[PDB]
Design a protein around this ligand. Structure first.
Ligand SMILES: Cc1ccnc2c1NC(=O)c1cccnc1N2C1CC1
Lengths: 398, 555
């Protein structure tokens, strides 16, 4: 028996519950989903069947780590827009601008807590959803959540008081270690404690279990000559173009070099306004030279990952040719490659900005909807968009 | 009535019960809408007089077609609108292609059902209507329902739902005789010796009848090869039925729209049907009655389709599980098609894939586009992706994803000797050929004056210009490449000031959709080594400033 012990969750003026879809899951994928949900229903509260409420929320069944069992990854993306973004004002868990500065960060899936511990009242009806049936032969019936849904940002907003007190005994015994709760996950980060963090983390993975049942099941240790003419079609062309994400900085007296015609001959290699501009530009290209590049916690963080070969270059920027961070993930031998990058980026946007970015993926809309859910482990869901036909590299890098 | 469990129904927040009145069809109306409304109780009490305090709704009697008695009608649209987003919608079509095979199935229809199941009580008050009582000075006869009313979306959602509650104990007391429902229609089927099937239908019809739902039949009443949504089906196989009647020209867009309709439905199993040219011309036609002139080829798409439409194309083994589920894309109808199958002859599902998408997304790239329709399709029809029998093979495929500017992933695919289509028609040398006559490209044209200019200028002091009138710069820059090719042999390196122009060539397209591009391709297929390269739109680049000049002045 709990019994009564809620928190008044509500939606922004002029809103209704999501009425999304549910992607037609592979059968085996539903078979499990159907299992995860039955134990959940008998595991009480966590779920109970609905029948006269329209709201629905995408639901996927997946596995995580080296895999053995499965797990539901429920896509509360519109309920967020619909509740959290609104109920993002107070309840809100603010973001520590040092978590990155604290160079070593282990993250713990402390989210199981959200379950039976606390709950929804009067609003359970919006966390509805459905588990399918191959070819819709049966009206694959729908459940309703009766506890905090391990998914929406609306939960930790609710669970920050319980979570705060629980983490209190540690925040002192082990003073300033920056702990950041984001959404079912904790970025306990710390200074380069000589490989150590292995310790304190398991220390906390344990403190959680002692002083509560909050469980980050396992230590979770994510512990971190020929200067051909054509060569200038290249050199210039991109050079001319790099400085665009810059002011009108010189390239031209290096430029003009190719006058007249004749493209397989070498130009110079050795000149004033050439070497003393190739280089002049050369020294100009180093990350920190920037300018009025600023985050405006008010304009969405757009991102554009560019497929490189075995490698993949990515670029998080807030508004046009003004990147706020532009690095490259890369693992040789690919849809399941983007998969690993789109995650790497968000898990990094977070540590850095308390919010995931909106992805512009170089993939066919639907070759993703079919298996992003293959090697997709993380519990949050970056909001993506399929931007194709196409990007422009042939440099950008070197 | 029905002893079943009522579903709570609240009126969209803020709103209220319908205030819609009407004005009589005299004796014709009332009289019909009474000798019946009186049976809304005394012959199965389906409503109760309760005339003053509630709201209202539209009474109206119709009935005519193929029968003998004046039917009532009240598909109340206001009530209909003061609650409606409310339920989760009936929404799905099981594709026969996957319905596994039962030995014997049956479709017991159900009696007036959406009226047997009950309707709340803290609601009904808004399902009232007034029948003027007596003649002209008709006092006012007012009812209100007690069951699902006809034409009120609560009905289908609640109904679909009340009946699968009822069909559960049964559907538990004897698995394996699993069933399906779509409106007054239960397509019950199992693999039982006809005999016992005969009685286990009685049980289903009996368990029904003790929950209202008095299933009208004589233990399976219905012509054995039922009419699904099209899909004339049978545990044997399935198909589609009447498919045509196109008299002769006066062919308006209204018609053509339906013909690609009739043809597409048919795609299901009839092999190689292929609507490109019959909806091709179907463009603009902003008006139905626009008797669009057909064309030369449309006649072939109707033609070649015509003959295809025999009957040596019907059904599948249904899902018959344990068999690989091969799916080969015998692609090449001057477009792309596929058939999902299980074993040897008889197919499982036939579906095309015309690609109304791209500046000639190649064979390789159109093929891939097609694997994720089959893959997406399969995943929904049988809950899995197919083995693929593909007319392509490594190399071609291999290198393209490996080097295509975007991402993609494909299930087990295996190749088969047939009409290749392996579009490795022309590839481009990445390093500017030396001992080659590099041509400088530039074309131009004015916005107002349609004055275009087909440029080019090589290192061998060569040059030429062919004028063009009625183009746009993004056209002159391609003729500006056609020439360069057309005026050279074997090698050839082209330098342009167009990202677009190359994007076409580089994407290495195919198929005539813009004749410049159509020929700028054929040249390539046969020109030992080539190498497009970009140079910043003018800005005085070497070789580009020069040609720039040629094509500029003349505007
Ligand atoms: C139209 C329809 C939709 C869904 N399932 C079925 C049917 N009807 C059949 O007649 C049918 C035919 C073949 C196999 N299953 C069938 N059945 C299944 C129930 C035995």
């Amino acid at each position: 028996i709990s019994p009564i012990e809620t928190v008044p969750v509500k939606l922004k003026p002029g809103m209704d519950g999501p009425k999304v879809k549910q992607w037609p899951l592979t059968e085996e994928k539903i078979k499990a989903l159907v299992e995860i949900c039955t134990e959940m229903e008998k595991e009480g509260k966590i779920s109970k069947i609905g029948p006269e409420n329209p709201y629905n929320t995408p639901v996927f069944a997946i596995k995580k780590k080296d895999s053995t069992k499965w797990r539901k990854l429920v896509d509360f993306r519109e309920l967020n827009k619909r509740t959290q973004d609104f109920w993002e004002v107070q309840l809100g868990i603010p973001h520590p601008a040092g978590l990155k500065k604290k160079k070593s960060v282990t993250v713990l899936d402390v989210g199981d807590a959200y379950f039976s511990v606390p709950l929804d009242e009067d609003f359970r009806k919006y966390t509805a959803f459905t588990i399918p049936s191959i070819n819709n032969e049966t009206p694959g019936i729908r459940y309703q959540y009766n506890v905090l849904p391990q998914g929406w940002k609306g939960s930790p907003a609710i669970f920050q008081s319980s979570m705060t007190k629980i983490l209190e005994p540690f925040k002192k015994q082990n003073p300033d270690i920056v702990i950041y709760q984001y959404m079912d996950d904790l970025y306990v980060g710390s200074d380069l404690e000589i490989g150590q963090h292995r310790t304190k983390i398991e220390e906390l993975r344990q403190h959680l279990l002692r002083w509560g049942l909050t469980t980050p099941d396992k230590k979770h240790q994510k512990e971190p000559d020929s200067w051909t003419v054509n060569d200038i079609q290249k050199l210039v062309g991109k050079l001319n173009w790099a400085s665009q994400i810059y002011p009108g900085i010189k390239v031209r007296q290096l430029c003009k070099l190719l006058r007249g015609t004749k493209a397989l001959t070498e130009v110079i290699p050795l000149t004033e306004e050439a070497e003393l501009e190739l280089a002049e530009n050369r020294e100009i290209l180093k990350e920190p030279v920037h300018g009025v590049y600023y985050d405006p916690s008010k304009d969405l963080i757009a991102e554009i990952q560019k497929q490189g070969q075995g490698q993949w270059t990515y670029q998080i920027y807030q508004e046009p040719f003004k990147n706020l961070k532009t690095g490259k993930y890369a693992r040789m031998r690919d849809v399941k490659q983007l998969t690993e990058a789109v995650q790497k980026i968000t898990t990094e946007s977070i540590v850095i900005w308390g919010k995931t970015p909106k992805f512009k993926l170089p993939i066919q809309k639907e070759t993703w909807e079919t298996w992003w859910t293959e090697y997709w482990q993380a519990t949050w869901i970056p909001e993506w968009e399929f931007v194709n036909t196409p990007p422009l590299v042939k440099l950008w890098y070197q | 009535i029905s002893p079943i469990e009522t579903v709570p129904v609240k009126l969209k927040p803020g709103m209220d019960g319908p205030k819609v009145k009407q004005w009589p069809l005299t004796e014709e109306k009332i009289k019909a809408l009474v000798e019946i409304c009186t049976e809304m109780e005394k012959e199965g009490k389906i409503s109760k007089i309760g005339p003053e305090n509630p709201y209202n709704t539209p009474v109206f009697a119709i009935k005519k077609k193929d029968s003998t008695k004046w039917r009532k009608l009240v598909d109340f649209r206001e009530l209909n609108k003061r609650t409606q987003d409310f339920w989760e919608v009936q929404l799905g079509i099981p594709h026969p292609a996957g319905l596994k095979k039962k030995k014997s199935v049956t479709v017991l229809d159900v009696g007036d059902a959406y009226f047997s199941v009950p309707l709340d009580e803290d609601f009904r008050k808004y399902t009232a209507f007034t029948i003027p009582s007596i003649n002209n000075e008709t006092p006012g006869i007012r009812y209100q329902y007690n069951v699902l009313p006809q034409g009120w979306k609560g009905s289908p959602a609640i109904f679909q739902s009340s009946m699968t509650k009822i069909l559960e104990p049964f559907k538990k007391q004897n698995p394996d005789i699993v069933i399906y429902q779509y409106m007054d229609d239960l397509y019950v089927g199992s693999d039982l010796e006809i005999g016992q099937h005969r009685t286990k239908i009685e049980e289903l019809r009996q368990h029904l009848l003790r929950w209202g739902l008095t299933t009208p039949d004589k233990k399976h009443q219905k012509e054995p090869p039922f009419l699904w949504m099209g899909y004339e089906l049978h545990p044997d196989k399935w198909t589609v039925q009447p498919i045509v009647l196109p008299e002769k020209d006066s062919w308006t867009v209204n018609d053509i729209q339906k013909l690609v309709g009739k043809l597409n439905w048919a795609s299901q199993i009839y092999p190689g049907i292929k609507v490109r040219q019959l909806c091709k011309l179907l463009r603009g036609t902003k008006a139905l009655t626009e008797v669009i002139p057909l064309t030369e080829e449309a006649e072939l798409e109707l033609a070649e389709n015509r003959e295809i439409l025999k009957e040596p194309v019907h059904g599948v083994y249904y899902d018959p599980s344990k068999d690989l589920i091969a799916e080969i894309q015998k692609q090449g109808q001057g477009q792309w098609t596929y058939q999902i199958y299980q074993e040897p002859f008889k197919n499982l599902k036939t579906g095309k894939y015309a690609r109304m998408r791209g500046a000639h997304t190649n064979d390789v790239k159109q093929l891939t586009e097609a694997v994720q329709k089959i893959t997406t399709e399969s995943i929904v029809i049988w809950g899995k992706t197919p083995k693929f029998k593909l007319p392509i093979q490594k190399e071609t495929w291999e290198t393209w994803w490996t080097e295509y500017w975007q991402a993609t992933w494909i299930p087990e695919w295996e190749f088969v000797n047939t009409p290749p289509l392996v579009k490795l028609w022309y590839q481009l040398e990445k390093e500017p050929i030396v001992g080659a006559e590099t041509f400088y490209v530039d074309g131009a044209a004015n916005r107002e004056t349609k004055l275009g200019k087909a440029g080019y200028v090589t290192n061998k002091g060569r040059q030429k210009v062919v004028p063009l009138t009625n183009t746009t710069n993004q056209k002159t820059e391609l003729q500006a490449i056609y020439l360069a090719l057309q005026d050279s042999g074997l090698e050839v390196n082209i330098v342009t000031d167009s990202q677009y122009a190359l994007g076409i060539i580089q994407a290495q397209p195919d198929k005539s959709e813009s004749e410049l591009v159509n020929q700028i391709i054929e040249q390539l297929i046969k020109k030992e080594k080539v190498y497009l390269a970009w140079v910043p739109a003018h800005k005085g680049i070497g070789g580009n400033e020069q040609v720039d000049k040629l094509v500029s002045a003349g505007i």
